[PDB]
From a paper:
The Na+/H+ antiporters are widely distributed secondary active transporters that use the proton motive force to efflux intracellular sodium ions. Mrp antiporters are unique as they usually consist of seven subunits (MrpABCDEFG) encoded in a single operon. Because of the operon’s distinctive properties, Mrp antiporters have been classified in a separate category, cation:proton antiporter-3 (CPA3), in the transporter classification system. They support intracellular pH homeostasis and Na+ efflux in alkali- and halophilic microorganisms and are essential for their survival in challenging environments. The largest two Mrp subunits, [name] and [name], are homologous to each other, have 14 conserved trans-membrane (TM) helices, and are thought to participate in proton translocation.
Therefore we purified the complex in a milder detergent Lauryl Maltose Neopentyl Glycol (LMNG) and collected a dataset again at 35° tilt. The best dimer class refined to 3.7 Å resolution, while the best pseudo-monomer (after symmetry expansion) class refined to 3.0 Å with excellent density in all areas including previously disordered edges. Each monomer consists of seven subunits with a total MW of 213 kDa and comprising 50 TM helices. A striking feature of the Mrp complex is the tightly intertwined interface between the two monomers. The thinness of the dimer interface is mainly due to the two very short N-terminal TMHs of [name], of only about 15 residues each, which form the bulk of the interface, resulting in only ~20 Å total protein span across the membrane. A very thin hydrophobic belt is clearly unfavourable for membrane protein folding and so it must have a functional role in Mrp, most likely by acting to significantly disturb and thin a lipid membrane in this area. Our cryo-EM maps revealed strong cation density (stronger than waters) both in DDM and LMNG samples. The cations are coordinated by the conserved H37c and H40c within the two large hydrophilic cavities (which we will call double cavity) surrounding these residues. On the basis of these considerations and according to the analysis of cavities and tunnels by MOLE we propose that the Na+ pathway (which applies also to K+) starts near H42g/H131e, passes by the highly conserved D35f, traverses the large Na+ cavity between [name] and MrpAC, passes by the key E706a and enters the double cavity where at least two cations, as we observe, can be coordinated between E706a, H37c, H40c and E137d.
Author numbering:
A (entry chain B): 3 to 140
B (entry chain E), H (entry chain e): 1 to 158
C (entry chain C): 1 to 107
D (entry chain F): 2 to 89
E (entry chain G): 8 to 111
F (entry chain A): 678 to 816
G (entry chain D): 1 to 489
């Protein structure tokens, strides 16, 4: 009952789903897409990995628990609002921000994208919590 | 076969670093020079000078497109025909192919062939069952076609 | 065109209402789904359906479709999906522990 | 023109719907739903050519990936119970 | 729209999808329908997407790569879908329309 | 059929010029139909019997009254007197004041982003509640 | 600075998020939730002093102007409701420390608590209809999970019932927002109030006002929309039930109040006579159910229904004395119903039974609890040194001043019947000889109930302290011109 | 180990093609995305997730530089010393290294080590002779050093 064809087409189909979800996420402010559909299809790529494999194997391949993901994404959205609050502005004012981690020095981005990033992480986490909670119930 | 391609890419990097200009034209010039240099040094590598796998995977892409068009013309002349004429079959075929990548590209090629459809690759990687749409029409000629297909798949992997 | 959308959301409302008033629980959740579809189509219809470009400023058209009702619908869609997933897992739990589907028999 | 292709795809979707209504086994209904989704992707492509907008191609690749994931899920369901196995 | 190739690609993909539908109706077994549906609607949808790709590439000068990745994805994924449904039907002890010489 | 209703509502969203709604609608209807099929195949095999929808006359009268009532309120509301809208500001200031060309997403995260935070909260509560219902079995 | 208005919303929210990380560490769950609830009470008191000193507080969320972004508005009534919510939440949280077992609070209990108080606190301060929708679903989703958590058969069944009803009412609020957007074109309270007052002679506004009555009366149980509430509140455990009875039905009452004092003012005669008859039916249903049952939880449930009917009848008169009376009665009734559910929980803990006919003789073993329940019963009825007197006094006076004799007599007889129900509990349970129970020392959980009782007694004594807040609340409710010139600057 | 690097490069190409901008910044973005994707798909490959060979060849470069400096300090204190003190040696060492590339990088590392010089790697790929400059000083400690060196060479190639 070897699923060699299913596993190999999963291995070559999962990267284009992941690139498609990341491209949906990054192009949200200018074209259709956003954190919602990008998070749902990142979860769909992990769903395809769940369909090709076990439930312990996929958490071995992707070593995340998703409850911390939904908590940290909620933290990103609220912290974007708080960083808006401190500088004599109302909550979620959304000015620009430089990130030099150092990665690609002084990357100037609009802070609505980190709000979208919180949306992204909570959508991925919620969908995966639902699916792998139902899966191992028995 | 990928190590030679990576080695040609990094020799193009060394050529771009040997001058002080960084541009795609210098990358193509350095890639051509590295192609000549790897042609000189074919003895040390083990698999193959890397252009032959590139040309035969281009051959497999063209075989995919051509067998797709031929398969849909065959289905076109089966469906618009009076539909009492077909004769089904399910048959086995032995296999010499070992890795699961060549087995699935053989299966994906032979699915898209006119008159055939895969079901039950065996548990052992030793036989493949397949559903023929027309039994007396394509059962030995298309077996020669799939022998040529798996011959080309064998000579991809040397 | 809005008249046709009104006379089809009315049929979605009538179907949802008829499935909610039934004896089995899965029919009730199907009626919940149809009621959600009717409400979201009603938001889109009452926002307006006059022809223009999709809400994207790259397309430089003279007039655009209204951007507000689409955002309100997308909010309502994700909220309705959360409640629907919860209520489906709840129905699964009640099938597992109680052992019946009859809604009138639930006492 | 484009309206002719929409009529032809609409009648094709009606044909796949006739196969999803009847057909004794479940597998006929599954393949009919798969082809119906792919035909829906074609309808979205042609109506995007009609509306003269490049704003719906993500819908097309989305319909493709959703159709593949749903069909492999239900094909796993017909084979020996679960769609998601338990850990060893 | 003004191109012969774009129009003939769109109409050929549409007609070939309708051929997939009448093959879904007329063929007697699950496996023959798998043949017809798989190959014919795969090539039909790729012809339609190539036509739409070429139309937006010509009369708008906009290179849309999402259509090309859709074509590659559908080509990769619809025959393996037909393979999985056909193996799922065969393992369910389902056989129709006068089985010939076939082995297990 | 509920699945077909969902995918055709997505096709309405395509046809009424709403791309984001179509994308999210397609994915959410596929997940929800998978959850309905989860809920179907674990029905108890006793007292199931697969029986049709029982016809009661009062249910049909109430349902037709509900549908025609909300239809006629929608027609009366849509076709009366009106003030226009406030979306000229959003099509005039999505790029001049915010950083965006999309307008559904800029409404969702910048102009009215205060209520997107709490739908994220609703999804979080839903996932945590599903986990809590499945795992906690004190009886 | 000006973000003080968000501190009732932001403080529990953050808290709920950081309670997700450590489920199995119940001690730190208790410590963080307790400290954050105390900070919530302090921040709500600071907000109430802020709205008392200078005017009504409006905050645009972005830097966007008043029609076009989300605006949060705190007037004096919303600040009073936030402070009352904070006090009830603190008492229910300490009762939750003593009452909820270990297994239920390893599975995210305090997170769901904090999300419920997020939902109610966000619902009392908002300036948009659709944002109010979103806060209703935050509140309702957390209430679904708090109702079902634990997973016995009873709370499974009535979670199915409660969830079904609230899904239907959520869809109805969606279609009401859709109709009103098609008529007006805006979504914030103040600007659509201005637009409705610019075309106030149209019948469709009356139809949509009646639809909002139906939605918000599905939220807070009015006749004939009450039918979900007895079984749904017979299901949950005791501090969850105290949260539900204190908070959930009273935000529908506030939404009716804001709707008919802000939005729909033209053609007032039809809407107010409809509210009057629905309120009379609600009072009659509540007192019939309170008389009928020999079960403690059902008695307190139908007292919730009766007090909601009295508040709606106070809303149905557009006089400032009736509005003042229903604000006083609203605050004390939130506090009092939370108190009475905590009493019922302590008595059930002692007796291992909920039937009044099963046990007697609790004064001989639990004197402090007995006389505390006696004072709680007399304060529920409306005896003048206690809390709920000046509210129904002003309601009765405003109904007599508008020539409604029969309805005022209905209010007074309802007060009599609710006194009879709670004193039936006291006289059959506490008095008599000892037969029903076994001596068991209670501990700890009696003290939040005593804290609520002391605050209710001090509320009844000190009306002159707590009145000028209610006077500014009345001055902004019967004049929405100050509301719409505060927001639309 | 090179196939994964080539696969990451072509996935960065697919990322640059999925948009319409061609620049090195988008190439680095696509390379990071492909690094994450290949971290997800580590199960299908056979050798190793490819960052560990990159870090250990950086380790071998640093070992080359450090042993060069230590060797020249050792020769500095041998030559300026009164030259009657050194004790020569030639000794064998067994070898588990199979391919000639790891054998010659072992030989080029152990030539440049303080106090050692290679002569006569055997005809069999099984033993290696070596000339020690100081016999009693470095004959068992430096043997532990070369055991650590060939251990690091073994964990380069997994
Ligand atoms: C900086 C200055 C230029 C450095 C690079 C010069 C060219 C090195 C490669 C030429 C060469 O002989 O290639 C292989 C040796 O590989 C090797 O020696 C390993 C790769 C060396 C990369 C050096 C740059 C990093 C032969 O292949 P082979 O047969 O030895 O290997 C078995 C694989 N089938
Ligand atoms: C076409 C659209 C539908 C596609 C999916 C349809 C097939 C799966 C439906 C459920 C089958 C019946 C079922 O409940 O099977 C149980 C497993 O279900 C489960 O495990 C339920 C979860 C199934 C998740 C499937 C996800 C499909 C794709 C979702 C959209 C794309 C991804 C978006 C993120 C086995 O029952 P049992 O007796 O074993 O008991 C459970 C403990 N083992
Ligand atoms: C706010 C107050 C936070 C600090 C007090 C609560 C945590 C007390 C210590 C618990 C602890 O160490 O939890 C670890 C993570 O902590 C945490 O994650 C707690 C800190 C949360 C920070 C939130 C922002 C990031 C995981 O605990 P474990 O490995 O011992 O678990 C084994 C059985 N669960
Ligand atoms: C100058 C102006 C002052 C303004 C004040 C305004 C505020 C007034 C609020 C009054 C609140 C009273 C609260 C009830 C009393 C609690 C008593 C707890 C201890 C207790 O039960 O003592 C019993 C004796 O006291 C008793 O029996 C006494 C309590 C019973 C009478 C309660 C009368 C309430 C009248 C209505 C409200 C006014 C013991 O009795 P035991 O025999 O079981 O001994 C068992 C041996 N430990
Ligand atoms: C507001 C209502 C406050 C009412 C007055 C305070 C009630 C408790 C008085 C002290 C009684 C003994 C407390 C013992 C103790 O450590 O209790 C802890 C709870 O903290 C507490 O009970 C202290 C809570 C303080 C809340 C008010 C803070 C204001 C600043 C843990 O409880 P446990 O382990 O004793 O019980 C679980 C048995 N299953
Ligand atoms: C083991 C221990 C057992 C203990 C058991 C106890 C059981 C109950 C026994 C009776 C308790 C009696 C409590 C008496 C409280 C006296 C009043 C509090 C002082 C105070 O500032 O009162 C007013 C404001 O209070 C307020 O506004 C506060 C209430 C409002 C809270 C908000 C939520 C409702 C101001 O009154 P004033 O001096 O201005 O007016 C009078 C003429 N001007
Ligand atoms: C154009 C659209 C994107 C096409 C590329 C998508 C990603 C393909 C590679 C992902 C993947 O699974 O890689 C390997 C499969 O390789 C393969 O399937 C062969 C290479 C595929 C290259 C495709 C582009 C030309 C896994 O490796 P493996 O384990 O299967 O192979 C043993 C080697 N250690
Ligand atoms: K809805
Ligand atoms: K919908």
């Amino acid at each position: 009952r070897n699923d060699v064809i299913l596993r190999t087409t999963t291995a070559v189909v999962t990267p284009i789903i992941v690139l498609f979800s990341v491209q949906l996420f990054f192009a949200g402010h200018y074209y259709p897409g956003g954190g919602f559909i990008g998070g749902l299809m990142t979860a769909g790529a992990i769903v395809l990995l769940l369909l090709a494999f076990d439930i312990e194997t996929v958490r071995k391949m992707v070593p995340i628990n998703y409850k911390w993901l939904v908590a940290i994404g909620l933290l990103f959205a609220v912290g974007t609002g708080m960083s808006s609050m401190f500088l004599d502005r109302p909550f979620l004012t959304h000015a620009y921000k430089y990130v030099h981690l150092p990665l690609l020095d002084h990357t100037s981005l609009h802070t609505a994208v980190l709000f979208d990033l919180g949306v992204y992480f909570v959508v991925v986490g919620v969908t995966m919590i639902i699916i792998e909670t139902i899966g191992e119930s028995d | 076969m990928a190590f030679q391609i990576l080695l040609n890419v990094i020799l193009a990097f060394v050529w771009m670093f040997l001058t002080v200009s960084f541009d795609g034209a210098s990358f193509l010039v350095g890639y051509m020079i590295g192609l000549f240099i790897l042609f000189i040094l074919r003895r040390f590598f083990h698999s193959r000078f890397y252009l032959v796998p590139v040309f035969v995977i281009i051959k497999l892409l063209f075989i995919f497109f051509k067998e797709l068009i031929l398969s849909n013309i065959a289905v076109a002349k089966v469906v618009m025909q009076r539909s009492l004429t077909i004769q089904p079959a399910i048959f086995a075929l032995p296999t010499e192919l070992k890795k699961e990548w060549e087995i699935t590209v053989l299966a994906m090629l032979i699915t898209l062939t006119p008159g055939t459809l895969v079901l039950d690759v065996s548990d052992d990687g030793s036989t493949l069952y397949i559903h023929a749409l027309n039994s007396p029409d394509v059962h030995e000629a298309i077996e020669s076609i799939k022998q040529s297909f798996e011959k080309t798949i064998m000579e991809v992997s040397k | 065109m809005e008249l046709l959308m009104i006379v089809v959301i009315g049929c979605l409302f009538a179907a949802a209402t008829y499935l909610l008033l039934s004896k089995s629980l899965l029919r009730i959740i199907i009626g919940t789904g149809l009621l959600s579809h009717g409400a979201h189509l009603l938001l889109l219809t009452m926002g307006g359906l006059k022809a223009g470009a999709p809400p994207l400023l790259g397309e430089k058209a003279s007039r655009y479709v209204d951007p507000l009702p689409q955002a309100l619908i997308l909010t309502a869609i994700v909220i309705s999906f959360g409640v629907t997933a919860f209520f489906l897992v709840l129905a699964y739990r009640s099938y597992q522990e109680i052992g019946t589907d009859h809604m009138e028999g639930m006492k | 023109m484009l309206n002719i292709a929409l009529v032809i795809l609409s009648l094709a979707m009606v044909g796949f719907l006739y196969r999803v209504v009847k057909g004794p086994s479940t597998a006929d209904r599954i393949i009919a739903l798969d082809a119906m989704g792919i035909t829906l992707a074609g309808i979205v492509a042609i109506v995007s050519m009609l509306l003269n907008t490049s704003a719906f191609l993500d819908v097309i690749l989305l319909i493709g990936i959703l159709a593949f994931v749903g069909t492999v899920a239900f094909a796993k369901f017909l084979e020996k119970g679960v769609v998601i196995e338990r850990g060893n | 729209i003004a191109n012969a190739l774009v129009v003939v690609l769109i109409l050929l993909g549409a007609v070939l999808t309708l051929l997939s539908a009448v093959g879904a109706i007329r063929l007697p077994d699950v496996y023959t329908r798998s043949h017809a549906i798989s190959k014919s609607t795969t090539l039909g949808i790729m012809c339609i997407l190539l036509g739409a790709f070429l139309h937006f590439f010509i009369e708008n000068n906009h290179f849309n790569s999402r259509l090309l990745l859709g074509i590659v994805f559908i080509f990769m994924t619809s025959p393996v879908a037909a393979h999985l449904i056909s193996r799922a039907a065969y393992y369910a002890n389902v056989e129709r329309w006068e089985g010939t010489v076939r082995d297990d | 059929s509920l699945g077909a209703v969902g995918y055709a509502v997505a096709l309405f969203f395509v046809l009424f010029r709403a791309p984001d709604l179509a994308l999210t609608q397609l994915v959410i209807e596929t997940i929800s139909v998978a959850l309905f099929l989860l809920c179907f195949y674990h029905l108890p095999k006793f007292t199931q019997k697969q029986e049709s929808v029982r016809f009661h006359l009062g249910n049909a009268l109430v349902s037709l009254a509900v549908g025609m009532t909300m239809s006629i309120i929608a027609f009366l509301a849509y076709a009366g007197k009106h003030f226009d809208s406030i979306s000229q500001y959003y099509v005039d200031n999505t790029y001049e004041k915010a950083a965006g060309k999309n307008m559904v997403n800029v409404i969702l995260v910048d102009f009215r982003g205060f209520d997107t935070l709490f739908e994220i909260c609703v999804l979080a509560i839903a996932a945590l509640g599903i986990y809590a219902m499945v795992k906690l079995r004190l009886a | 600075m000006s973000n003080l208005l968000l501190l009732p919303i932001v403080i529990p929210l953050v808290t709920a998020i950081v309670l997700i990380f450590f489920p199995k560490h119940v001690f730190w769950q208790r410590v963080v939730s307790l400290a954050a609830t105390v900070g919530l009470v302090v921040a709500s008191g600071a907000l109430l002093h802020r709205v008392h000193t200078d005017g009504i507080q409006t905050l645009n969320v972005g830097n966007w102007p008043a029609p076009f972004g989300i605006t949060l508005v705190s007037d004096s009534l919303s600040a009073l409701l936030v402070l009352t919510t904070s006090i009830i939440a603190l008492a229910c949280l300490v009762y939750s420390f003593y009452a909820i077992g270990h297994k239920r609070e390893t599975f995210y209990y305090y997170s769901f608590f904090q999300f419920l108080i997020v939902g109610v606190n966000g619902a009392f301060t908002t300036g948009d209809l659709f944002n109010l929708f979103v806060f209703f679903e935050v509140m309702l989703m957390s209430s679904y999970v708090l109702l079902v958590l634990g997973g016995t058969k009873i709370q499974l069944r009535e979670t199915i019932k409660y969830t079904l009803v609230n899904v239907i009412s959520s869809a109805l609020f969606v279609v009401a927002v859709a109709y009103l957007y098609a008529v007006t074109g805006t979504l914030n309270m103040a600007h659509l109030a201005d637009r409705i007052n610019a075309l106030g002679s149209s019948p469709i506004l009356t139809v949509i006002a009646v639809l909002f009555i139906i939605v918000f009366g599905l939220k807070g149980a009015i006749f004939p929309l009450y039918f979900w509430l007895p079984g749904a509140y017979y299901a949950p455990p005791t501090p969850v039930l105290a949260l539900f009875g204190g908070l959930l039905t009273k935000v529908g009452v506030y939404s009716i109040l804001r709707t008919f004092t802000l939005l729909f003012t033209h053609d007032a005669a039809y809407t107010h006579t409809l509210l009057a008859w629905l309120a009379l039916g609600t009072i009659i249903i509540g007192v019939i159910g309170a008389v009928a049952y020999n079960d403690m939880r059902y008695i307190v449930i139908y007292n919730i229904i009766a007090a909601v009917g009295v508040m709606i009848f106070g809303i149905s008169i557009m006089t400032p004395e009736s509005v003042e009376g229903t604000i006083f009665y609203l605050l004390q009734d939130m506090v009092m119903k939370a108190m009475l559910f905590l009493f019922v929980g302590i008595i059930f803990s002692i007796t291992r039974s909920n039937d009044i006919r099963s046990f007697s003789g609790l004064i001989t073993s639990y004197p402090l609890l007995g006389w505390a329940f006696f004072i709680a019963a007399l304060s529920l009825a409306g005896i003048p040194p206690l809390s709920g007197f000046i509210g129904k006094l002003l309601i009765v006076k405003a109904s007599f001043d508008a020539q409604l004799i029969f309805e005022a007599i209905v209010i007074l007889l309802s007060s009599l019947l609710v006194l009879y129900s709670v004193m039936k509990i006291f006289m059959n349970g506490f008095w008599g000889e000892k037969k029903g129970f076994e001596q068991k020392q209670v501990d700890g959980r009696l003290f939040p109930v005593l804290f609520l009782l002391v605050l209710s007694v001090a509320y009844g004594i000190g009306i002159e302290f707590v009145r000028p807040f209610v006077l500014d609340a009345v001055n902004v409710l019967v004049d929405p011109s100050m509301y719409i010139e505060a927001v639309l600057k």
